[PDB]
């Protein structure tokens, strides 16, 4: 039918891969803030 018969739904493994994205982006922000902060201590 019109996207009705199969009625595909996403389980918890899919949403963990999504939460594995958002955590990996927040860490990648925080790792850059360190690389900025390591050159604030390097130069002064």
């Amino acid at each position: 039918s019109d996207s009705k018969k199969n009625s595909y739904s996403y389980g918890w493994s899919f949403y963990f891969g999504a939460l594995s994205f958002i955590i990996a982006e927040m860490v990648g922000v925080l790792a850059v803030h360190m690389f900025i902060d390591r050159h604030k201590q390097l130069t002064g």
């Binding site: 039918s1 018969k5 199969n6 009625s7 595909y8 739904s9 996403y10 389980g11 918890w12 493994s13 899919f14 963990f16 891969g17 999504a18 939460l19 594995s20 994205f21 958002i22 955590i23 990996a24 982006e25 927040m26 860490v27 990648g28 922000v29 925080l30 790792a31 850059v32 803030h33 360190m34 690389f35 900025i36 902060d37 050159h39 130069t43 002064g44």
Partner: protein, 420 residues
């Protein structure tokens, strides 16, 4: 037949006992009637069919603005929004090989605002102003030109569509639920059909109907239509299809015939045994059917004398102004956004009027690196991605045909393995 006195009643009795010569009437061609009077070739076909109350038109939702794009794309837009803002931060903030660091105004908080602004088609105050920064800004502009022009292509149509939603599409769909109620006639051939049912679906239907409180059976067809119309869409009545099409074409036009015919039977002109009329009556039915008269007499009485007029009335199409009820969800989010904005401004005012650390964020990164690595390996390894109908261990390999894998089953697939 009366069971003991062994005399026929009804119109079949009128033909056997010589009172009448021909039964031009909706008389069902059965076995036990065939043995005592001849039947014609059937002049009209019918079967057991499902009558449900006609569902009201589905109004669009509160959140009908996000209906042009599926919920796949909205989640992937949010992922692409966060993805661009982090890359636009990472690109515009390196140590440039003491004001060289502080040149670009793209922190992580501004870069979220540049990416939001480009997507919402409002120009933002800051510009990337660096070669690798402008490629991120340039590509996200081409993203949002395509998506928004795809989104707003037919946004007025998705806000003003109503669809009839059938709760039941067929007899198997009525089999797998108990909220909507079955019903048949208390004394009829239709209830006889569910006694002698070796089909597993129809036998499942009969064990329900026998053990049901209050009684799903009705004494007359007139009460069975009224129980459909009273019980507000929670009752489905099983009756012959020719009556079912007739009740649909009568006012208040609040019935609907769903599903194909479960059995197939016929109405035939009945003559007594040995009547000379029996041969021309057979041949006259065959002359009318080839000429289309029987197609013409059915299309007249059932549909053209119809009080409903469903064909021409549903055929006309109009496009109309947006109502406030159609886009009321956008206003609910806006005033919800305003109340959130006052609440943030208060809690930051109380905090400023009334301890970040480099060591704490270092432990925050180590856990978050492990938390990302844990969630990703569990996602790739374990197989609970998609819940859909699929091939299971009934006939998981295509070993023999005709078996159809229990006609299908719910199956939690994964990135490599499917499991049911």
């Amino acid at each position: 037949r009366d069971a003991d006195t062994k005399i026929w009643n009804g119109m079949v009795g009128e033909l056997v006992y010589g009172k009448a010569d021909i039964a031009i009437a909706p008389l069902t061609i059965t076995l036990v009637r065939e043995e005592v009077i001849d039947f014609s070739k059937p002049f009209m076909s019918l079967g057991i069919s499902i009558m449900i109350k006609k569902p009201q038109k589905s109004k669009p939702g509160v959140f009908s603005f996000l209906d042009p794009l599926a919920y796949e794309i909205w989640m992937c837009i949010v992922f692409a929004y966060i993805g661009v803002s982090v890359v636009l931060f990472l690109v515009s903030r390196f140590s440039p090989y003491q004001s060289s660091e502080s040149t670009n105004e793209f922190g992580i908080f501004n870069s979220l605002w540049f990416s939001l602004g480009a997507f919402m088609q409002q120009g933002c105050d800051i510009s990337p102003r660096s070669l690798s920064g402008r490629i991120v800004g340039g590509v996200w502009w081409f993203f949002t030109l395509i998506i928004i022009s795809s989104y707003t292509a037919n946004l007025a149509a998705f806000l003003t569509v109503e669809r009839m939603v059938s709760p039941i599409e067929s007899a198997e769909d009525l089999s797998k639920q108990t909220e909507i109620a079955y019903g048949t006639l208390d004394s009829g051939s239709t209830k006889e059909f569910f006694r002698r049912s070796k089909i597993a679906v129809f036998d499942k239907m009969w064990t329900y109907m026998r053990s049901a409180e209050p009684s799903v059976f009705v004494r007359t067809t007139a009460e069975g239509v009224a129980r459909v119309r009273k019980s507000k869409g929670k009752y489905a009545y099983l009756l012959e299809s020719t009556m079912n099409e007739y009740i649909e074409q009568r006012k208040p036009c609040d019935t609907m015939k769903v599903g194909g015919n479960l059995d197939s039977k016929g109405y035939g002109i009945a003559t007594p045994k040995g009547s000379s009329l029996g041969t021309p009556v057979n041949l006259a039915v065959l002359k009318l059917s080839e000429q289309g008269v029987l197609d013409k007499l059915k299309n007249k009485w059932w549909y053209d004398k119809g009080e409903c007029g469903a064909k021409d009335s549903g055929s006309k199409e109009k496009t109309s102004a947006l109502s406030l009820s159609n886009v009321a969800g956008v206003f609910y989010i806006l005033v919800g956004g305003l109340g959130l904005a006052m609440l943030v401004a208060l809690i930051e005012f109380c905090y400023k009027s009334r301890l970040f650390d480099r060591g704490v964020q270092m432990l925050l990164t180590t856990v978050g690196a492990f938390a990302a690595f844990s969630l990703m390996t569990i996602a790739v390894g374990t197989d609970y991605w998609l819940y859909s109908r699929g091939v299971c261990k009934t006939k998981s390999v295509s070993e023999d045909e005709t078996s159809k894998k229990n006609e299908e089953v719910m199956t939690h697939s994964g990135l490599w393995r499917t499991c049911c």
